[PDB]
Amino acid sequence: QGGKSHAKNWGPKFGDGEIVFPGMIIMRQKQGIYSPGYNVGRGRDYTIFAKTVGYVEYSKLKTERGKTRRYIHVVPINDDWSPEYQKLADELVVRRAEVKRQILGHHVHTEPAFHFSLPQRNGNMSWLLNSVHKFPGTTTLA
Amino acid sequence: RLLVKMVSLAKTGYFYVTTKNPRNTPWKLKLMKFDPVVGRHVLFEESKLK
Amino acid sequence: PLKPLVFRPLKLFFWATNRHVHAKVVRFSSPFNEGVPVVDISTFDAFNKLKGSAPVVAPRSLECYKEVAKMVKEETARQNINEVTLHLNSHASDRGVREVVRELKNLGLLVKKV
RNA sequence: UAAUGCGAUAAUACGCAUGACGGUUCAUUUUUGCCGUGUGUGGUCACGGUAAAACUUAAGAAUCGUCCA
RNA sequence: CGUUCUUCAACCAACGGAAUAAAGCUACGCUAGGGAUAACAGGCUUAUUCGCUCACAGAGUUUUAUCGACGAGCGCGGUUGGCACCUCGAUGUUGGAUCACCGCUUCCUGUAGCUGCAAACGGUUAUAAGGGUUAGACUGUUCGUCUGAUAAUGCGGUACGUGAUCUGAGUUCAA
RNA sequence: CCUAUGCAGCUUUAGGGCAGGUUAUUAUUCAAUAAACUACCUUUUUUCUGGGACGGACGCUCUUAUUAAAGAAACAAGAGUGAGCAAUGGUUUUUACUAAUUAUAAAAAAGAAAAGCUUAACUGCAAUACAAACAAUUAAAGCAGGGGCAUUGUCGGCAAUAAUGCAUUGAAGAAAUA
RNA sequence: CCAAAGGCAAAGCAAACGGCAGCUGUAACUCUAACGGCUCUAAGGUAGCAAAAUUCCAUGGCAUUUAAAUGAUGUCCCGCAUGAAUGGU
RNA sequence: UAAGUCAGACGCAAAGCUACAAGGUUUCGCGUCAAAAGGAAAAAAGUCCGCCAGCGAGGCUAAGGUACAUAAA
Ligand SMILES: [K+]
Ligand SMILES: [K+]
Ligand SMILES: [K+]
Ligand SMILES: [K+]
Ligand SMILES: [K+]
Ligand SMILES: [Mg+2]
Ligand SMILES: [Mg+2]
Ligand SMILES: [Mg+2]
Ligand SMILES: [Mg+2]
Ligand SMILES: [Mg+2]
Ligand SMILES: [Mg+2]
Ligand SMILES: [Mg+2]
Ligand SMILES: [Mg+2]
Ligand SMILES: [Mg+2]
Ligand SMILES: [Mg+2]
Ligand SMILES: [Mg+2]
Ligand SMILES: [Mg+2]
Ligand SMILES: [Mg+2]
Ligand SMILES: [Mg+2]
Ligand SMILES: [Mg+2]
Ligand SMILES: [Mg+2]
Ligand SMILES: [Mg+2]
Ligand SMILES: [Mg+2]
Ligand SMILES: [Mg+2]
Ligand SMILES: [Mg+2]
Ligand SMILES: [Mg+2]
Ligand SMILES: [Mg+2]
Ligand SMILES: [Mg+2]
Numbered sequence: 001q002g003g004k005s006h007a008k009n010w011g012p013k014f015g016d017g018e019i020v021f022p023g024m025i026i027m028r029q030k031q032g033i034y035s036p037g038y039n040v041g042r043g044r045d046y047t048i049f050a051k052t053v054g055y056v057e058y059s060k061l062k063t064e065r066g067k068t069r070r071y072i073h074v075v076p077i078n079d080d081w082s083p084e085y086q087k088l089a090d091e092l093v094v095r096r097a098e099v100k101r102q103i104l105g106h107h108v109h110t111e112p113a114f115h116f117s118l119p120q121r122n123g124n125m126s127w128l129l130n131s132v133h134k135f136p137g138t139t140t141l142a
Numbered sequence: 143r144l145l146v147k148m149v150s151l152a153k154t155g156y157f158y159v160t161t162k163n164p165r166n167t168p169w170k171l172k173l174m175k176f177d178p179v180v181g182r183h184v185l186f187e188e189s190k191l192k
Numbered sequence: 193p194l195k196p197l198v199f200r201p202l203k204l205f206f207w208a209t210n211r212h213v214h215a216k217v218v219r220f221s222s223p224f225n226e227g228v229p230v231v232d233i234s235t236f237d238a239f240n241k242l243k244g245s246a247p248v249v250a251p252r253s254l255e256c257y258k259e260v261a262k263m264v265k266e267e268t269a270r271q272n273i274n275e276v277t278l279h280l281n282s283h284a285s286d287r288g289v290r291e292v293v294r295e296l297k298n299l300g301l302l303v304k305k306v
Numbered sequence: 307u308a309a310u311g312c313g314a315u316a317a318u319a320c321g322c323a324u325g326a327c328g329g330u331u332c333a334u335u336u337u338u339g340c341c342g343u344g345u346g347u348g349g350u351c352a353c354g355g356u357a358a359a360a361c362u363u364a365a366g367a368a369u370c371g372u373c374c375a
Numbered sequence: 376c377g378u379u380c381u382u383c384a385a386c387c388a389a390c391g392g393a394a395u396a397a398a399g400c401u402a403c404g405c406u407a408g409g410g411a412u413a414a415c416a417g418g419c420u421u422a423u424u425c426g427c428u429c430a431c432a433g434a435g436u437u438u439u440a441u442c443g444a445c446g447a448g449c450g451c452g453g454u455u456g457g458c459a460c461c462u463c464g465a466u467g468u469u470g471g472a473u474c475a476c477c478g479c480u481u482c483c484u485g486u487a488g489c490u491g492c493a494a495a496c497g498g499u500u501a502u503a504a505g506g507g508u509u510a511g512a513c514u515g516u517u518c519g520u521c522u523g524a525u526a527a528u529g530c531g532g533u534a535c536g537u538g539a540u541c542u543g544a545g546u547u548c549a550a
Numbered sequence: 551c552c553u554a555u556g557c558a559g560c561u562u563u564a565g566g567g568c569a570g571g572u573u574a575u576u577a578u579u580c581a582a583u584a585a586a587c588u589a590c591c592u593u594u595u596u597u598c599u600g601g602g603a604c605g606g607a608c609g610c611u612c613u614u615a616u617u618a619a620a621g622a623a624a625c626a627a628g629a630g631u632g633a634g635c636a637a638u639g640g641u642u643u644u645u646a647c648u649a650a651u652u653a654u655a656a657a658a659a660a661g662a663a664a665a666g667c668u669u670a671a672c673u674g675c676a677a678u679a680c681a682a683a684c685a686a687u688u689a690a691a692g693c694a695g696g697g698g699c700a701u702u703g704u705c706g707g708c709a710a711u712a713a714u715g716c717a718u719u720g721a722a723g724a725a726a727u728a
Numbered sequence: 729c730c731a732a733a734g735g736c737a738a739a740g741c742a743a744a745c746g747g748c749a750g751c752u753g754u755a756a757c758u759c760u761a762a763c764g765g766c767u768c769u770a771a772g773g774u775a776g777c778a779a780a781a782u783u784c785c786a787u788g789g790c791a792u793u794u795a796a797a798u799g800a801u802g803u804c805c806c807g808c809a810u811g812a813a814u815g816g817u
Numbered sequence: 818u819a820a821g822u823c824a825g826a827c828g829c830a831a832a833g834c835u836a837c838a839a840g841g842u843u844u845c846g847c848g849u850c851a852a853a854a855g856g857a858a859a860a861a862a863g864u865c866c867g868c869c870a871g872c873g874a875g876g877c878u879a880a881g882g883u884a885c886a887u888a889a890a
Contacts, residue, residue, distance in 0.1 A: 001607050001625045008711080009620060009681075022691060023678030030711050031656040036196035038223065043689045045710060046656090049679075051691060064282055065658065071197070073223075081199055081222050093677070122674045122694070131379040131726040143634075145383080147723090155724045159382065160636095160671070167636060176696055178381095178673050179724090183697055191383070192722065193660060193709075210318075212309045236309045250319055251309080280659050305659090306703055 016058060020050040021096065022089070026072055037071035050074050053089045146171070148186040154179035158186065195306075199223060200277040204303065208286040212236050212251050215264055215292065217276060231267045233260055235288075257288055261295035268301060275302045 010028050014020060027034055027048040036042045037059070039052045050056075057073035076085055101110065117136060119126050148158040148171070156177050171188040200220070207214040214234040218227035235251040238259035242248050248255050268274070283289060297303055 002623090003608085003610095004623090005611055005712090006687095007621070011620060013680080021678070023689095025678095025680050025689070028680070028689090029656095031654085032194070032710080033656075035194050035657090038197050038199055040196055041691070042196065044708095045689070047680080047689045049690065063658075067658085079222055079224070097677090124675050124694085126674075129379060133378095147382085149723085155381090157381075157723065158672090162636075163634090171636065173636090173669055173671095174697080175669070176672055178696095181673090181696070183669095183672090193657070195659085207307095207309095209307085209309070210311070214309075234309060239309095252318075282658085284659085304702085 014056045016056060018056050019054070020056055020074060021053055022051055022093065024050050026050060026056060034070045034072055037073035039074035039076075040072055048072055052085070053077065053092050145191050147189045147191045148173065148175070149189045150177050150179075151185045151187055152177060152180055157189075159191065162188070198306075202273060202276050203227075204276045204278045206279075206283050206286075206289045206292075208283040208289055213257070213260065213286070213288045213292065215260060217264075217268065217273070230271060230273070231264060233263045233267070235260055238263065252288055254291065257291040258295050261292045261299060264292075265296060265299045265301055275304065277304050280305065 008028070008030075010030060012027050013024075014026055020026065025047060026040070029046050029048075032046050034048065036048055037057070039050065039054060041049050041051055043049070052074055054074040054076045057075050059071045059073060061069040061071065063069055077088075080088075101108075116133065119128065119130050121128075143161055143163050146160060146162050148160055150156045154177060156179055158175060160171075162171055173186050174183050175186050176182070177184045199222075202217065202219055205216045205218065207216075212235045215231070216229050217231035218229050220227045235256045238256040239248060239251040242255060242259055246255070250256075268276075278284065278293070293303060
């Protein structure tokens with residue numbers, strides 16, 4: 001009788017000259033109207049995300065067969081295309097987290113603090129429990 | 143279509159859950175897949191999921 | 193399923209015409225600025241060279257395709273260039289272009305498509 | 307971009323060949339209409355847009371035809 | 376016997392799914408609430424209904440005498456509808472008896488034209504609301520059919536007038 | 551008339567029970583058990599809705615009008631779906647090809663078909679964002695292990711947008727305790 | 729008429745609780761169908777009565793009754809949806 | 818503020834449904850009412866001007882007015 005499907009927000013998220021950081025989504029689309037340019041990626045559903053620190057750019061290209069192609073680019077900070085820019089981006093990522101924590105305040109906790117320690121699997125932290133809970137280092141051999 | 147259990151032939155007890163069509167492939171399916179208990183790829187054989 | 197563009201400083205380009213095959217090596221600093229051509233060799237140059245010594249049929253021949261590859265190898269070696277990236281387009285699938293690329297790989301130049 | 311382009315063995319060594327006429331396909335914002343927003347006794351108001359839709363005269367480019375006035 | 380990991384299944388389709396499961400009647404009914412919500416009356420709307428003008432095609436056949444249409448516009452608030460604005464700590468139902476006030480879109484009694492108006496009997500238009508608008512058989516009726524007379528037996532509004540004036544045949548409690 | 555954390559009486563092949571009689575089985579010299587028949591006890595019998603009943607509907611996708619950011623409702627309108635594939639997945643090579651879907655101007659260094667080898671339709675984690683009351687839902691660079699095809703690129707299922715179900719209870723494989 | 733679903737009983741019981749059809753062709757002119765064909769069911773409503781305290785079309789058709797008849801009586805009749813011990817006349 | 822609210826109404830301007838009807842109904846942009854006294858249009862919730870701490874026999878204006886009712890040609 002009635003009914004409606006849940007809305008999908010297709011469209012761009014950033015314009016020309018806006019700053020982005022790695023992992024941020026730039027475009028949500030149903031079909032490949034826009035193609036990935038430099039310093040970007042594409043998901044299996046045609047979602048375009050940034051892979052470096054820089055500013056968003058838009059460009060159009062005319063192909064050999066007379067079709068029009070549209071790209072999305074991310075430009076480095078000072079137009080630096082050298083391979084040394086990657087390490088600068090890594091430092092900027094660490095700095096950005098520090099800025100956010102300072103603005104938020106101490107009472108917006110970003111890590112858990114339980115009365116027990118989480119198990120370790122394959123050298124990383126795991127959220128799955130072990131069959132038995134034991135204090136670390138409170139037992140001797142045999 | 144049906145759900146089946148792919149059981150390791152190394153007798154470690156590890157298994158996978160997959161989907162098969164018994165009419166198109168009326169034989170026991172076999173594949174090579176990673177076995178965490180041993181740490182390498184081994185041979186798996188189809189078995190009833192129950 | 194078009195892949196994202198990757199910026200490379202050194203790229204190899206081919207232009208296949210009715211009469212000749214042209215190869216260029218261009219260095220780039222950024223996508224927004226023009227490049228600088230460091231090598232410019234075509235079958236026209238090879239034909240003028242070989243014809244004096246060894247008769248050839250026409251510029252678009254197997255002898256000239258190998259000669260062009262050899263001349264490109266010498267220029268890159270002199271300038272200390274050992275790795276290049278090939279720009280893929282319609283002309284890249286021409287038989288003459290493919291013969292030149294195969295010769296370059298055997299000589300020792302490392303050509304990458306991706 | 308004549309190291310071009312096109313071809314009926316179509317491959318490119320050979321064939322046509324860059325001019326000139328004719329027909330097709332692509333500037334005082336050409337300046338009018340029209341549209342959008344704000345304001346409004348429903349228009350004697352203001353600004354912007356039309357590379358969304360109608361509408362002018364050229365000049366050039368890409369083929370095509372051609373013993374050429 | 377208990378815990379963790381890897382996994383699956385049933386009813387949840389009223390599909391955020393749980394009190395394990397699981398149909399009805401009340402005119403014998405009862406309590407708590409609403410004009411937040413219906414039935415009668417008022418209000419808004421005017422599709423529909425009705426009226427007028429343009430249109431003059433077509434029947435009559437010289438006449439737009441008379442009849443009358445496709446189509447368009449405007450008006451009325453009386454027909455069938457739409458909405459849910461007033462009233463559920465209550466605005467008494469249909470028809471009739473009795474007694475009324477008003478409009479004119481005039482049935483009779485008037486005035487002035489036209490006519491396919493000789494006279495008589497008529498037809499149609501404009502204008503006119505003082506007076507009049509019958510007695511009975513059938514039916515709870517409004518309505519409708521019929522009978523004997525009559526100058527003629529008009530329509531509508533008024534809480535579809537009128538139960539602190541009457542009637543209770545119908546409708547609408549318990550048999 | 552409609553609305554309730556509604557009440558009561560009555561009815562039955564609506565659910566559950568056995569607590570009188572009858573009946574069946576068994577045991578001791580007025581007894582014990584019950585998917586039966588009668589009697590009795592107790593419980594259940596949605597909501598939306600141009601008033602209620604009757605009819606219809608309840609999840610999830612695509613498209614139309616409210617212009618060319620996003621978003622936006624009515625018992626408004628026009629169409630799909632509760633799957634399929636052991637290849638129709640992954641990856642290399644060739645070219646007189648450039649389609650089809652429920653619907654759709656996706657896509658040429660891309661796809662489809664043909665030929666070969668394969669199981670990444672993995673194990674353990676994850677910066678940062680889209681969305682969003684919450685629950686959940688969506689995309690994803692990157693690190694370690696074992697692999698596939700290439701020979702230094704890609705693979706954590708399928709062009710994309712639907713093919714689904716919390717917790718509880720139950721069951722299976724393995725491992726650690728007691 | 730004891731089929732199906734129940735109840736009871738001596739494997740049977742309807743004056744226990746209940747049920748009791750449809751399509752189609754045919755006689756001088758016409759009409760009608762005495763008379764045929766087919767499907768299905770446990771069985772397919774027999775006599776009687778019938779515009780009813782039972783009838784939607786409806787104020788049914790005809791006759792009597794009145795100057796005038798949605799009335800009353802009689803009568804015609806597969807009767808939306810009459811009917812034989814929830815008895816028929 | 819771990820509060821109250823989850824019955825909304827109309828004007829101008831659009832679209833769906835209705836009959837390009839309704840003081841109808843469903844969304845959307847601005848404003849007013851709700852919770853807003855005072856002035857103008859006759860009375861005047863939603864239109865036009867304009868937001869009331871108190872008193873005073875001072876002055877200038879808005880919308881609207883300027884032969885009588887009724888202040889001002
Ligand atoms: K529900
Ligand atoms: K009332
Ligand atoms: K008169
Ligand atoms: K209504
Ligand atoms: K009886
Ligand atoms: Mg549906
Ligand atoms: Mg797993
Ligand atoms: Mg629920
Ligand atoms: Mg009461
Ligand atoms: Mg009301
Ligand atoms: Mg309302
Ligand atoms: Mg008159
Ligand atoms: Mg009257
Ligand atoms: Mg009355
Ligand atoms: Mg009275
Ligand atoms: Mg009674
Ligand atoms: Mg309800
Ligand atoms: Mg959340
Ligand atoms: Mg690898
Ligand atoms: Mg993939
Ligand atoms: Mg009887
Ligand atoms: Mg009797
Ligand atoms: Mg509510
Ligand atoms: Mg509400
Ligand atoms: Mg309203
Ligand atoms: Mg209030
Ligand atoms: Mg003054
Ligand atoms: Mg005065």
